[PDB]
Design an enzyme around this catalytic site. Structure first.
Site, short mmCIF file in Angstrom:
data_model
loop_
_atom_site.label_atom_id
_atom_site.label_comp_id
_atom_site.label_asym_id
_atom_site.label_seq_id
_atom_site.Cartn_x
_atom_site.Cartn_y
_atom_site.Cartn_z
CG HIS A 132 -5.00 -17.07 33.94
ND1 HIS A 132 -5.25 -18.36 33.61
CD2 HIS A 132 -4.88 -16.38 32.77
CE1 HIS A 132 -5.26 -18.44 32.28
NE2 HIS A 132 -5.06 -17.27 31.75
CG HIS A 150 -9.17 -14.81 30.86
ND1 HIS A 150 -8.43 -13.68 30.59
CD2 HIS A 150 -8.37 -15.89 30.74
CE1 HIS A 150 -7.20 -14.10 30.25
NE2 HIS A 150 -7.12 -15.42 30.36
#
Ligand SMILES: Nc1ncnc2c1ncn2[C@@H]1O[C@H](COP(=O)(O)OP(=O)(O)O)[C@@H](O)[C@H]1O
Ligand SMILES: Nc1ncnc2c1ncn2[C@@H]1O[C@H](COP(=O)(O)OP(=O)(O)O)[C@@H](O)[C@H]1O
Ligand SMILES: O=C[C@@H](O)COP(=O)(O)O
Ligand SMILES: O=C[C@@H](O)COP(=O)(O)O
Ligand SMILES: [Mn+2]
Ligand SMILES: [Mn+2]
Lengths: 161, 489, 489, 161
Positions: free
Chosen positions: D68, D83
């Protein structure tokens, strides 16, 4: 205020009362290993007070860490097991005091453990104190006496072989 | 002349050669790799089961100097629940084997529950909603492969269990069959009807096309080229059989990778009300009998964990030795729920946990504890058994790998307050399969021909420590309750 | 000319020699035995502290080639809370030293609670009802020795702490004094009044006769024969001082046997409302200052546990190495409550526990986890600190044995999301005591003479993994909650 | 129904939008390490859909196990950190799909990860996707662009040195 220092009156296998009170049927004990004579056989005793002692001359074998029970082999080749009360291991050794040591030779009568009958009276699950012969098979006959007994005096059992 | 047994265990694959006298002639063992893709997951390589088994076979024949000529039949025992899918043409897995321990299909069960099949499932499978059995495993597999279901309806896709798979690999693809014992484990099979459950097959979207043919645990299913394969049974049930389970009220406990306690219920499928599974076993000629089973996921494996990861010991054997150096666990407890809690807890969320540590606890307390967990769990399952069946055991018959551990054995005995009987031949699981095969071949005719190879090697009787047992258990109970529900959803 | 410091730690006793330039000249370390009579209990042999210390001293002087002639003074630092009682005449303990960790006087606290001194105790001692401190330890001792209290009123019985005891053994019995820092730790002393609490002394049946004289953390208390002993301070507080704590809002974290985070509150005794203790430290000339403290029982010792009992490693140092071989703990958690949970939990019933194990967790996951516990706990205490004080740290100053572990350090940093600063000299605790002594001897005059030996060796800054930190902590929190309340009463 | 197969239109340091939507102030992120620019500096982006891509030619460095987020070093000596969302590690990698691999050299634009904007929309704590330069000090100047951005097209930052 205690007679420990004074002289006491002094009078096949005879197992002598190791603690005092009234004799009870093993079958009476509220624990199967006892009642169904899985650990072995013998009697039980509803106690009167203060102390447990050797019931045969011999050598103490086990002395439970929470010292509420101990074992001992007789000079005659008998294993006895004395277990104060029921589930007493939970008390965590409170009410108890180890007098003797794990390997001693003892005469009938020597103090093995001492205890507090009343804390044990309200703390313990039960007070019955089975006394059993463990090496069941190595013995020939097992005779069970009755009534009142006096520590290191009255006999609780007579045994053959 | 002799029979041959195949024991394809969780830990390893084996091969035994017995004579008419039922004598263990030669053995072949070969461990195989356990794989852990993720957390609560366990898998094995279908081709490795396969490989390891085949090889084990040969190696034995060879070891004893035996020819195809002299082998009457072949018996087959395997690990339960563990699921496989394979392309028909190819003879190739479309994915590794999901293990009985394997907690992956947990959510699915969560649905199944959510829907309300609990009652249904119990009632007809005799099973319980748990990632333990086969259904969800299959579903998960098809749900995770593109050309799947469809490829399967067209029927390019075979479903199976170690027996189903071990068989078809030997009968060059000719035979696609499983036994009764095996099948009950799957979640897709109806125990009263003795057949595939449709409502299951639906709910879980499984296509009959893949299910194999289901048959007696003794019957020649076909022939192979070492010849006739006459017996098949789930390991646990084979051990039951080899201990001469076989009669109502009879029970054994097996200490292997996990632990399984089974009790024969004749022809009565007893409904469990204490977290036990209701299931299938054999009657004296391989006929459908029922049974109560208590499954415990981790027992001998804990030992392997101290052995291979934690690295405290060099051999499982050494555990008796270290464990004895200590007298007490020093207050430590080990809930080995490395892959959930099975019976009677059935919490696929509990995870391992060690408890009650203080500065002076050492290696040895820990080992010992791990051993002890084994007895606690047995006890847990035992009590259920007794309740469910209303019968009180006076002795426990046992068998398995761990049964070599006098410490464990004895400790079992005390914590139980029951005699523990240890058979002279540990390899009972195998014997079952043989018997199951030779009977089916007139190699034996009758079980009674055999009421004698079950000589008891040793009795373990409760010691004065048996007195503490209730104290010790309680903590155990207390520990358990804190290992439960670790993982989230 | 140089000063000499004595650091009598939980794990070991040390001795340092510094020059005017404050340079670490020579050191003497000597580990000593920890003893565990029972479960949550810890003890040490008074004569061994003693012995190990004396020896360490010599050995140093000797090592550097120094004479009594050239040593300006002597500084003294010791482990807190840990209690001793000794016959006056003899110079002999009437029992081993009860340790700060030592959970024995748990019930007593249970009374104290039951009575209602919680409020009182907090309010005047700044402490919390816990077997951690000195009161109950003393009481338990007298309550377990026949000729005790009485023998003590007549005053044949001395009470003390490692400093009180370390001093009197050197001043041949002449000097019976403790410092302010030390005394606050005892539970018997009033922090506002700067004196013995009577209501305490009563309640716990302690007789003033035994309490020593209480004094500034800098002052020549007397002379000895290696000469003047001019400084005394609790270890934690000495480190505070040596890091140049000294000003309001200033804070350090010490990673040793346990972990202690302290923050200077000038002259204001801040009331904690988040499980922190309110306590005494030094002001820039050794004067009474206040402070907030967070105490964590186990940190470097966990490592010693993996080292000496579990035997996974050969050196604490090796932990960085193994821990790094793994990247993740693999889901494992280690609540090192081997002797309860201190701040801010204060549960003398929690006990160690390892969690979240599965078949493929190994040695290395476990080690790493143990390391990580150290950071979690620091974090726990940190947050309290921030709340209590209303101030947000931007960096963490640290010192101690473990601070050598880049892994731990860094990991600390990330899990914190704060810079971590690692001083160039790890031996800060010692330096404190020296400073405290040389100032008191004009060996230095002024702390500013020294604003330079506090050169920073290294900064640890948050890495991108700092992002996970909240996820990781949560589990930690979850773990903790299950270690709590294991032991019963 | 997807253009992956077709040809697209194709036009100091410029960091290119690695994902799409509207640019947001780092200071806007509901996480201190972000907002106080502890991990570093840069912008954030409220996402529009489907995918994250390299924002510089360079080599992918880290690819979080729950993928992710990832990192990457530019051929020009810049460390970037991307992020996705906030606390997204809790999603446990659900909504995500790793296209690239942990060590690849990439051109601006190559797919790095793919994702499910809507599951993430209701599952995630927040959707903001900071993009930061980590090696703060090794860089001279940091210029922050605004508004809408289009993946692998609009630039989000210009940087000196
Ligand atoms: N002395 C022993 N103590 C404990 N476990 C043992 C001992 N000897 C072997 N083992 C264990 O016994 C188990 C073998 O059980 P078994 O019936 O062979 O395995 P399987 O699950 O493959 O059927 C293993 O889990 C092994 O780690
Ligand atoms: N690399 C390291 N990693 C972890 N712990 C370490 C390392 N090196 C030494 N230690 C640990 O650091 C601690 C020493 O802390 P210190 O400040 O000396 O001890 P004390 O409690 O006696 O004051 C010990 O607990 C030790 O086990
Ligand atoms: O539940 C499946 C069991 O049959 C596991 O058997 P095993 O211990 O022999 O591998
Ligand atoms: O709480 C007492 C502390 O001072 C322990 O100190 P230590 O880690 O140096 O032994
Ligand atoms: Mn097996
Ligand atoms: Mn120290």
């Amino acid at each position: 205020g205690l007679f420990d220092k004074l002289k006491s009156l002094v009078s096949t296998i005879e197992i002598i009362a190791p603690l005092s009170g009234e004799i009870v049927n093993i079958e009476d004990v509220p624990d199967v290993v006892f009642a169904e004579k899985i650990v072995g056989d013998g009697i039980a005793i509803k106690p009167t007070g203060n102390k447990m002692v050797a019931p045969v001359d011999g050598t103490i074998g086990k002395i439970f860490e929470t010292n509420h029970a101990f074992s001992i082999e007789s000079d005659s080749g008998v294993e006895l097991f004395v277990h104060f009360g029921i589930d007493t291991v939970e008390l965590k050794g409170e009410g108890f005091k180890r007098i003797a040591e794990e390997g001693q030779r003892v005469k009938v009568g020597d103090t093995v453990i001492e205890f507090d009958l009343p804390l044990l009276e309200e703390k313990a699950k039960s007070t019955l104190t089975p006394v059993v012969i463990s090496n069941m098979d190595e013995i020939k006959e097992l005779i069970k006496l009755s009534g009142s007994v006096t520590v290191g005096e009255t006999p609780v059992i007579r045994i053959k072989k | 002349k002799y029979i041959v047994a195949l024991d394809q265990g969780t830990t390893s694959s084996r091969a035994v050669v017995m004579d008419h006298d039922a004598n263990i002639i030669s053995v072949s063992q070969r461990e195989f790799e356990q794989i852990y893709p993720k957390p609560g997951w366990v898998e094995h390589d279908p081709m490795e089961i396969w490989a390891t088994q085949s090889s084990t076979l040969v190696e034995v024949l060879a070891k004893a100097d035996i020819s195809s000529d002299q082998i009457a039949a072949i018996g087959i025992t395997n690990q339960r629940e563990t699921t496989i899918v394979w392309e028909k043409e190819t003879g190739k897995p479309i994915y590794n084997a999901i293990v009985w321990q394997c907690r992956r299909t947990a959510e699915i069960c969560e649905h199944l529950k959510r829907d309300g099949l609990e009652d249904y499932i119990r009632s007809n499978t005799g099973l319980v909603i748990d990632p333990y059995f086969s259904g969800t495993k299959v579903k998960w597999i098809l749900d995770h492969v593109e050309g799947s279901r469809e490829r399967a309806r067209r029927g390019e896709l075979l479903f199976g269990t170690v027996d189903t798979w071990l068989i078809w690999k030997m009968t060059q693809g000719r035979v696609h069959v499983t036994d009764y014992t095996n099948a009950s484990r799957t979640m897709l099979f109806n125990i009263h009807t003795l057949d595939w459950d449709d409502k299951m097959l639906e709910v879980l979207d499984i296509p009959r096309e893949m299910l194999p043919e289901v048959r007696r645990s003794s019957e020649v299913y076909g022939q192979t080229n070492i010849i006739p394969i006459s017996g098949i049974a789930g390991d646990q049930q084979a051990a039951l059989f080899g201990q001469l389970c076989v009669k109502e009220g009879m029970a054994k406990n097996t200490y292997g990778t996990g632990c399984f306690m089974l009790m024969n219920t004749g022809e009565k499928a007893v409904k469990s009300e204490n977290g036990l599974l209701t299931t299938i076993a054999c009657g004296p000629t391989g006929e459908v009998n029922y049974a109560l089973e208590g499954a415990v996921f981790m027992a001998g494996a804990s030992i392997q964990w101290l052995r291979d990861e934690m690295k405290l010991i060099n051999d499982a054997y050494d555990s008796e030795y270290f464990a004895t150096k200590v007298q007490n666990t020093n207050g430590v407890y080990v809930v080995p729920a490395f892959t959930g809690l099975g019976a009677p807890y059935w919490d696929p969320y509990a995870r391992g946990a060690i408890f009650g540590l203080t500065r002076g606890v050492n290696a040895n307390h820990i080992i010992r504890a791990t051993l002890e967990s084994i007895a606690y769990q047995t006890r847990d399952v035992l009590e259920a058994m007794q309740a469910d069946s209303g019968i009180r055991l006076h002795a426990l018959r046992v068998d398995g790998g761990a049964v070599a551990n006098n410490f464990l054995m004895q400790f079992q005995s005390d914590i139980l307050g029951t005699r523990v009987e240890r058979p002279e031949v540990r390899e009972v699981t195998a014997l079952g399969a043989a018997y199951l095969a030779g009977l089916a071949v007139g190699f034996w005719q009758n079980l009674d021909e055999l009421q004698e190879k079950a000589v008891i090697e040793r009795e373990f009787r409760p010691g004065i420590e048996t007195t503490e047992r209730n104290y010790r258990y309680a903590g155990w109970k207390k520990a358990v309750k804190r290992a439960m529900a670790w993982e989230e959803h």
